[PDB]
Amino acid sequence: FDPKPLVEIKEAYRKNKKFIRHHSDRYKRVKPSWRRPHGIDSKVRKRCKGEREMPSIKYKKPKEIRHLLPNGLRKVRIFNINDLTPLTSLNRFYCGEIAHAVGARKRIAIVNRAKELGICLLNGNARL
RNA sequence: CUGCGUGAGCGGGGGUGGAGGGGCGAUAUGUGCAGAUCUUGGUAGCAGUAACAAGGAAAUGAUUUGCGCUGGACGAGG
């Protein structure tokens, strides 16, 4: 089908590189979120041997698998019972997710609609 | 603890918590920090360290005995 052969092209493009800020393992006041250096003596900016590597557009994914869920579908966020309506002509390419702040009274209503329409839920079986 | 994004960042799950919180378009800005012998607050190592005190005794201590030298009044100040 759609999910099964895509999940193995997705795995061919997985990188395990992280892009962590220089010296963030040495000072607690430097946070790990990425920043580019500007110093007059900076060696990360020159790409010397041994230093951490910088991010760039040559690591970006093909358009067909970028943002794919691990099971092979696209994610949609759902707040209402009326949010499921557009997922009827396409219920084999999407996987719904119920927002965190929706209460358990309304979650019963959403979970029953999606069962009688054949729509996958990434989030069901929680807070029940 | 876990998913997505080259990245700035954005989601979901289990505890805690006990009242509010968001998306999208235009618009107004006191709009993003590692440094300034930066400002204010809190906290380490140094270190239980330097420095200081432990005043002669007699089971008891209104009794016996050993040592030091300021002692008593008026004014200012309190």
In the three-class reduction of DSSP (H, G, I as helix; E, B as strand; rest coil), residue A49 is classed as coil
The total number of residues shown for chain A amounts to 128
Strand B, nucleotides < 7 Å from a protein CB: these are 3-9, 11-14, 20-21, 34-35
Cβ neighbour number for residue A72 with a 10 Å cutoff: 19
Q: What is the resolution of this structure in A?
A: 2.7
Longest dimension (CA), chain A: 64
Cα–Cα dist A29/A43, whole Å: 21
Whether the beta carbon of A89 falls within 7 A of nucleic chain B: the reply is no
Whether the beta carbon of A56 falls within 7 A of nucleic chain B: the reply is yes
Cα–Cα dist A109/A112, whole Å: 5
Which neighbouring-strand residues pair with A76? A96
Q: Which helix (H) or strand (E) holds A95?
A: strand A94-98
Whether the beta carbon of A67 falls within 7 A of nucleic chain B: the reply is yes
Cβ neighbour number for residue A25 with a 10 Å cutoff: 10
Are A54 and A19 contacting, i.e. CB atoms less than 8 angstroms apart? yes
Q: What are phi and psi of A107, to 5 degrees?
A: -70, -30
Are A78 and A113 contacting, i.e. CB atoms less than 8 angstroms apart? no
